[PDB]
Amino acid sequence: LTAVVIILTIAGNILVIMAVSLEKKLQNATNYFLMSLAIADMLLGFLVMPVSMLTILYGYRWPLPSKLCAVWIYLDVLFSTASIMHLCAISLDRYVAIQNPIHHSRFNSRTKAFLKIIAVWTISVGISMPIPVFGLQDDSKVFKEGSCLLADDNFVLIGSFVSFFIPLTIMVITYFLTIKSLQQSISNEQKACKVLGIVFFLFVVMWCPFFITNIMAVICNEDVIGALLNVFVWIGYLSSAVNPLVYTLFNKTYRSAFSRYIQ
Ligand SMILES: CCN(CC)C(=O)[C@@H]1C=C2c3cccc4[nH]c(Br)c(c34)C[C@H]2N(C)C1
């Protein structure tokens, strides 16, 4: 079951890589931010998920060297954060595009896309900047009874608040403002509302339980909490596996590209 998620991740990300890099009609500023998101989930699907499957297969005892535990957790907080701020920036851009379309089109450029990519990756690197320089030289953030689990309450609580919950409330405000703003064109607006709702509720359903139970594991019968964490982390990874699909399949050109490249 676990091996299915890794394969789905690599395939669904390589498909959008090939669809944006080898299709003239889809070379746009928005498709390049989607390209960056796909790159983030692509790296997450190879540098993290195989190692997580290895940990599940072996158990808590980890055959890889203890020195390597610090950087493998650093990649999780790097790539998963990067994807989360990618989604947050996409929602903000959609709100600017739907609420004020003339001005968005006036300000739309490739420079804005590069600025967005630089900003989200800078923020992701900054949030995960404590862990390697505080974890390689000690056991504070890297180890807890031979589990290779992030065991720093100062960073688990504070880190999640900036990495997930600030983006989460930004996304909820953005969704409520957009759906309050889209109220032949009427059917298009209804389909846009449908897509926005589906995407937002997928992201919330798939990432919210992990961080809630992670906070509860620190504030708070922890044996069941450990297993729930161990399942919801994989749910979170499956979200990054899915995200390239739902953000692109609705577009006709992307759907045709996936139909053709799969042949
Ligand atoms: C190494 C695997 N692992 C052990 C089960 C984890 O807990 C990993 C730790 C994580 C974490 C902790 C704190 C703040 C955070 N922000 C973001 Br985004 C993440 C995060 C991603 C999250 N990923 C999915 C699991």
From Swiss-Prot:
It is found in: Cell membrane; Cell projection, Dendrite; Cell projection, Axon; Cytoplasmic vesicle. Changing S163A: Decreased ability to bind serotonin and psilocybin. Residues 59-67, 137-153 are extracellular. A motif (DRY motif) lies at residues 93-95. It comes from the Eukaryota. Changing L150A: Strongly increases dissociation of bound lysergic acid diethylamine, without affecting binding affinity. Reduces signaling via arrestins, but has no effect on signaling via the phosphatidylinositol-calcium second messenger system. G-protein coupled receptor activity is regulated by lipids: oleamide increases HTR2A-mediated activity. Inhibited by IHCH-7179 small molecule: IHCH-7179 acts both as an agonist activator for HTR1A and as an antagonist inhibitor for HTR2A. Coiled coil: none annotated. GO terms for cellular component: axon; caveola; cell body fiber; cytoplasmic vesicle; dendrite; dendritic shaft; G protein-coupled serotonin receptor complex; glutamatergic synapse. The keyword Glycoprotein applies. Signal peptide: none annotated. Its main location: membrane. Serotonin binds at D76, N214. It is a multi-pass membrane protein. Detected in brain cortex (at protein level). Detected in blood platelets. The chain crosses the membrane at residues 2-18, 33-58, 68-92, 113-136, 154-179, 194-219, 224-249. Disulfide bonds join C69-C148. Keywords: Behavior, Cell membrane, Cell projection, Cytoplasmic vesicle, Disulfide bond, G-protein coupled receptor, Glycoprotein, Host cell receptor for virus entry, Host-virus interaction, Membrane, Phosphoprotein, Receptor, Synapse, Transducer, Transmembrane, Transmembrane helix. Belongs to the G-protein coupled receptor 1 family. Binds lysergic acid diethylamine (LSD) in the orthosteric pocket. Bound LSD dissociates extremely slowly, with a residence time of about 221 minutes at 37 degrees Celsius. This is 5-hydroxytryptamine receptor 2A. It comes from Homo sapiens. The chain holds residues 80 to 396 of 471 of the full protein.
